[PDB]
Each structure stands twice: as C-alpha cells, then as structure tokens.
C-alpha cells in the first residue's frame, strides 16, 4: 500500500554534563533500520535491520557524517533557542525533528514532510507544498525569516522529492522479504472474571505486521465505543506488533458481544465471540 | 572584509621538523576547510570543521597530520615530523550554510610549504637589473628594464618593481615559472626573470628611480644553521637603477 | 572520488571560445561547479550548476550531462585576464567536501596591433656588467622555445601590458656567462617568420 521513510532526531541539553544527548533513528514503514546514539561507544550510524547491512563503506561513513553534523546543528540550536526564549542555563531542554517522504502503491512520490519542535511543542514545520513554512508564533518567526533567506526549503524539496524517494524505493526492494510482508494477526479472546455478576472479556491480536490494525466490538447490533479498551499498538520485540481491545459485561451475556478484527493480511475480517 | 588569513605565506623547512600551519577564517563562518594541493594529486580535502568539531577528515593521512579548531577564530594543521612528500600548497577556507548551499567556499592564499632533504642547498637570490638599450629607444619610444633573480633555491620568491617608492604593476612581466640554473643536478638552483617597459620620456628623466625587489622565503631564526656562510633566511634582495641621458 | 581532467596548457587566442571539461567516475555526485585559480592565489568560485541544466553568466556557461558523466565550462569572448588554472569541483549528499579535478591551465594570448620583432642587447647597472637579451615585440602567434647545445637560458615568454598606450607586448629573455654568446642568433633556434 503506502510506504514511508522517516528519520526521527532528538537532542537534550545537559548543562552540567557537557555536550548534549543525541538520538537519531530511521524508519521504513514501521520497521526501524538505523540509529545513532551520541552516548554510545561506536559514534557510528548503526544498522538495525538485516537488509541495510548489505550497504557498503561509502554508505556507512556518509551516513555517520550526515548524523554527526546534524548533532552539532542541534547543539547550536539548543543554544539559539535558550536565547530566543530567554531560558536559564541549568535547565535541560529538548530539540526534536522529524522528516521523511511517503509513496503510494505505485511507489511514486505521494507527499513529503519536515517538522521541528523545541521542548515538545510544535515550533516550525514545512508545509505540504514544500515551498513554504509554518511557524509557531514567537520564536519560530525568526527561524523562518532565516530559513526563507538561505532557501532551506529549496534544498529540502530536492531531498524529499528526489533522493528520499530513490532511497526509499531502494530499501523496499533490497529488503522486500521483511518490509513487504504481511503477518496476519493471531487473534484470541480471554475469559477472566471481574466478579460473580461480570466477566473480563479481552480481544487480543498478536504477532502482526504492519501495525495498522482495527479491532472493534459489537453488542448484537452496532455498538462501537466506550466498553472498548483500545491500548496503543505496541511492539512485541520480534519486529511484529501486539494490540487488544477488551469488554467487561453482565456474566452469561458473553455470547452477544463480538470482536471484529481487520488487518491487511487478513483475507476477510475475522470475527470472534466467546466460544469454549 | 579581509578574507581567510593564513600564516605563513611560505614555509621552507627541513624534514623531521614540526610544521604548524594557521588559519583564521572569516568572521561569522562556522565551517572551516583545510585543503592541500600538490601537482601529483591536485586540490584535495584534508579535513573540515563545523562549529569547531571535525566532520569530514577522510583525506588526513594515517599518521603525522593533526588538526584542530581550539575556537571559532583559529585553526592549526600540524605535521610532525614532516617529510619531503608533504611539500604542497595548503589552503584554508571558510563558508556558511547559505553559501555552502550554492557551494561557495572562500579561500586563503595558502602556505606554499617546501619540506626538504637538507637545508644545505638553500640559497637566497643574487639580484641584478639591466637598463634599456639605446637601440630600443629610437626604434620605439620605449625602454624595457630587465630584472634577473638567480642562484636561488627553493623557488619561493616574489618579484615586484617599485618605481619611485610606489610599487608598479603596469608594464611588468614576471616569468610564469622559475627556470633551473642547473638542469644537471637532481636538486638544483633557479633563475627567474622579469621586465618593465616605460616611455623614453620616463626612462630618460634622471628624477625616476627603478627598483627590482625579490622577497625570498627561506629559514627563520630558530632553524639551526651550522655552516658559517651567511644564513639564508626570509629576506629581501634588491637591485636598482636611475634614469640617465649620457 | 576521482575526476579526469586534461591539464593543458591550453593556449587560445584573445577572442576565442574555450572548452574546458572534466569527466568523473562516481555518480553519487550531485552539484558541479568551476573554480578558477590565478597564479599564486586562492581559488574563487566562477560558476556553479545544480544538476542537468546549464547556468549562464555573461561570457561563462557551465554544463553538466550526468549520463555521460561530463562537466563543462564555456568561455566566449576570451579575455587575457581569463588566463588562469580552471578547476572543476563537485560533491554529494554526504559532506561539503569538494572533489576537484587536477585543473586545466588556460592561457589567452592577447592580440597585438603592430608586431615589430627585434633582439636587444643589455649591459648591467654595475661594473661587472654581464649582458642579457630581450627578444620582444613579436606577435601572439610566435612560440618561444629554446633549449640548446648550451647551458644558455631562455625564458618562456610573457605578455607585458601597457594599458594606457593600448600597447601590449610579448618578450622573452636569454642570457649566459660564456664568451661565444651574442644577441639575435641566441634566440634563433626559435624559428621566427
């Protein structure tokens, strides 16, 4: 279906303990593939998937450069923003950035993005048209006026439309075995008891890739929400994802409540109800 | 306003010796680049710093070369020991993001470094001037002076004419390259020639003073000379001449 | 990170059009430019060109064709001030490091209204007067070359420019310490018109 490549960077000042913490990660879809950590020994951009490890020396040096230079820009940016916002120097503060590019089932370019935040609130982001910026009032306006004048969007556009997409297309091929799979969920329903007069009914969905899934409950007709415990989709550890929604209901009415599981990689929507 | 500054302009040294190269970049530029140039490999990057930390350092050779930016306004590139194969010009350069965008880097004039086998073949130039022919002056209303700087090595010279205490550039013609005195020795001495043409009505006026100045780069007072020839050190050798009519 | 470039010297007349070019082997490259370096100076940027597309700037056009992997610069209306080494740089996504070609030395020989070729003798300002020869006022078509049966020195020429009289002159110089030396004949191995 759709496909994305996103890089997430984070940077945290630490007045006392010298230079700040840096953590880059890169995703394709929802598979993590590279990471950098400043505090780690290697000071190398590190693979985190079997399909990128193929990549040569040209790649691994040049990615380590790009990321290092990026940490330095954040290092400065932390300083600049402590400025613009007038903050004390014993305070820890955070810069975050995420950029990346999506594509359709045809793998053609479909959109592009770049968004930036100081202390975990929206600072400045590049508009969908990739020509212009949107800035969160006070300080951001100064950043923008700088970025307008170095033609930063013109460079970004070239990355996001051209290069990002080429690389994304490379990754989807080179690692097709892992990125272009579907693992159907492994649905199952638990029956614990809230009481004598009630019965914790939980609808699982395990071992699935990709993470886009839909669980829904129904009481005879058309119930859909608010006896529906929808936990955030979470990772197992093994590259696949777990999710569940749960209903707790007047005991011996199990039968009239039904879970509805919808995944890419399901043939039809699977539907479960208390059985044994 | 003045651009990238590099000390020294020329550095003749003996091998074994720590050479230290400096650069102050343009005020406001957070990117600083050390490039070398030889004839055999061309212009090459050594390293570049971004807000004082090194980023690309793939062209630094394996030992001997070291480089820092102790702050935003200064960098050393340090070779220890030197070898004769470090002879090169070594440029420095600075830029900003909005200029590296369009790949504008701004360069210094570079430190022509000659690392040598033994300082005992260094010699400053002996400089002479020659004064225009009578022939040339009736054939055209014009008189060419000629300056030779000869007997020198290595070829770190800078020839300039000064007419009456101001330097002239009009009518001058320094040679493209030195030419070797002895093409027969592996490490031989050089000559370099220049000309200055002016009018008959200017050469003939005895008021006018013509000077040929050859700024030579050589050793410095710390380099340990131990013959008792005069030591060849960065000095000015000159020859001069006045207008005449007799 | 290696780029082929014919080092010249490329010698063309004042008025000409010069093609300079590099070809390069790695296609990760993405920005292409031309720096010009004058004798003893730093290189300054001449022209740059984003991608396939040609930028034009008065007399200078610069091109990149990426399939062929071929970079070029075109100077129309050659001025002598364009005498210089010309170096094609270029880089990629990963770093600001420029990759330079060896360089090509351009030499543009300024036209001369009235050639007047002669071979003058000159004594020194000092008592041990050595002599020395000026072969001068020859046209921008004339090559000086010499090398001899002697340890006789002849300089490659150069062009002296008298801007205010509009009188540009070529000149080369020749000397030796031994007796059997003389002017006129001393330059005669360069086989003039």
């Amino acid at each position: 279906g759709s496909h994305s490549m996103r890089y997430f960077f984070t940077s945290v000042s630490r007045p006392g303990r010298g230079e700040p913490r840096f953590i880059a990660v890169g995703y394709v879809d929802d598979t993590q593939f590279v990471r950098f950590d400043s505090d780690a020994a290697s000071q190398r951009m590190e693979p985190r998937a079997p399909w990128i490890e193929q990549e040569g020396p040209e790649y691994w040096d040049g990615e380590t450069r790009k990321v290092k230079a990026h940490s330095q820009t954040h290092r400065v940016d932390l300083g600049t923003l402590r400025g613009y916002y007038n903050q004390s120097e014993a305070g820890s503060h955070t810069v975050q950035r995420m950029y990346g590019c999506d594509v359709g089932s045809d793998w053609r370019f479909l959109r592009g993005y770049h968004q930036y935040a100081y202390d975990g609130k929206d600072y400045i982001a590049l508009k969908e048209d990739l020509r212009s910026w949107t800035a969160a009032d006070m300080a951001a306006q100064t950043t923008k006026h700088k970025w307008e004048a170095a033609h930063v969007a013109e460079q970004l556009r070239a990355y996001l439309e051209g290069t990002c997409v080429e690389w994304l297309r490379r990754y989807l091929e080179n690692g097709k075995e892992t990125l272009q799979r579907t693992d159907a969920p492994k649905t199952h329903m638990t029956h614990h008891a809230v009481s004598d007069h009630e019965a914790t009914l939980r609808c699982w969905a395990l071992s699935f890739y990709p993470a886009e899934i839909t669980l829904t409950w129904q009481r005879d007709g058309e119930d859909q929400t608010q006896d529906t415990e929808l936990v955030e989709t979470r990772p197992a550890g093994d590259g696949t994802f777990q999710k569940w929604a749960a209903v707790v209901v007047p005991s011996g009415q199990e039968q009239r409540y039904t879970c509805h599981v919808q995944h890419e990689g399901l043939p039809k929507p699977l539907t479960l109800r208390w059985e044994p | 306003d003045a651009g990238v500054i590099q000390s020294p302009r020329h550095e003749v040294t003996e091998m074994g010796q720590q050479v230290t190269l400096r650069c102050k970049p343009i005020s406001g530029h957070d990117y600083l680049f050390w490039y070398r140039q030889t004839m055999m490999r061309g212009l090459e990057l050594l390293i570049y710093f971004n807000n004082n930390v090194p980023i690309d350092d793939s062209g630094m050779p394996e030992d001997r070369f070291s480089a820092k930016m102790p702050n935003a306004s200064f960098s050393t590139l340090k070779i220890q020991p030197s070898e004769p194969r470090d002879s090169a010009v070594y440029f420095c350069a600075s830029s900003l993001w909005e200029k590296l965008a369009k790949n504008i880097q701004y360069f210094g004039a570079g430190t022509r470094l000659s690392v040598l086998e033994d300082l005992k073949n260094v010699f400053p130039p002996e400089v002479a001037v020659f004064e225009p022919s009578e022939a040339e002056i009736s054939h055209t209303q014009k008189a060419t002076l000629v300056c030779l700087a000869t007997g020198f090595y290595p070829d770190h010279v800078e020839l300039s004419w000064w007419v009456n205490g101001k330097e002239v550039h009009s009518g001058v013609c320094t040679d493209p390259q030195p030419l070797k005195e002895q093409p027969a020795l592996n490490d031989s001495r050089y000559a370099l020639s220049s000309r200055l043409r002016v009018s008959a009505t200017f050469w003939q006026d005895p008021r006018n003073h013509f000077r040929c100045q050859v700024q030579f780069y050589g050793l410095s007072e710390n380099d340990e000379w131990t013959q008792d020839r005069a030591k060849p050190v960065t000095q000015i050798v000159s020859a001069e001449a006045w207008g005449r009519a007799d | 990170k290696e780029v082929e470039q014919d080092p010249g010297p490329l010698s063309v007349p004042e008025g000409a059009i010069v093609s300079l070019n590099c070809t390069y082997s790695n296609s990760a490259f993405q920005y292409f430019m031309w720096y010009r370096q004058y004798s003893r100076k730093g290189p300054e940027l001449l022209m740059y060109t984003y991608s396939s597309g040609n930028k034009e700037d008065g007399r200078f056009t610069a091109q990149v064709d990426k399939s062929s992997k071929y970079i070029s610069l075109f100077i129309r209306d050659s001025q002598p001030s364009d005498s210089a080494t010309y170096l094609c740089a270029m880089r990629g996504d990963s770093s600001y490091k420029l990759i330079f070609g060896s360089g090509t030395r351009l030499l543009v020989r300024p036209d001369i209204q009235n050639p007047d070729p002669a071979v003058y003798q000159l004594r020194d300002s000092k008592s041990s007067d050595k002599s020395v020869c000026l072969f001068t006022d020859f046209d921008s078509q004339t090559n000086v070359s010499q090398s001899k049966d002697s340890d006789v020195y002849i300089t490659d020429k150069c062009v002296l420019d008298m801007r205010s009289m509009d009188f540009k002159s070529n000149s080369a110089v020749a000397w030796s310490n031994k007796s059997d030396f003389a002017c006129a004949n001393a330059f005669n191995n360069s086989i003039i018109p």
């Binding site: 990615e63 450069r65 230079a69 600049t80 930036y116 | - | 990963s94 600001y96």
Partner: peptide, 10 residues
C-alpha cells in the same frame, strides 16, 4: 540515507 550534509540551523 538522510538529508545531508546538515540541517540549516535555526
């Protein structure tokens, strides 16, 4: 393969 060589600073 990231944006490179480095972001423009704020």
């Amino acid at each position: 393969a990231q944006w490179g060589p480095d972001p423009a600073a704020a």
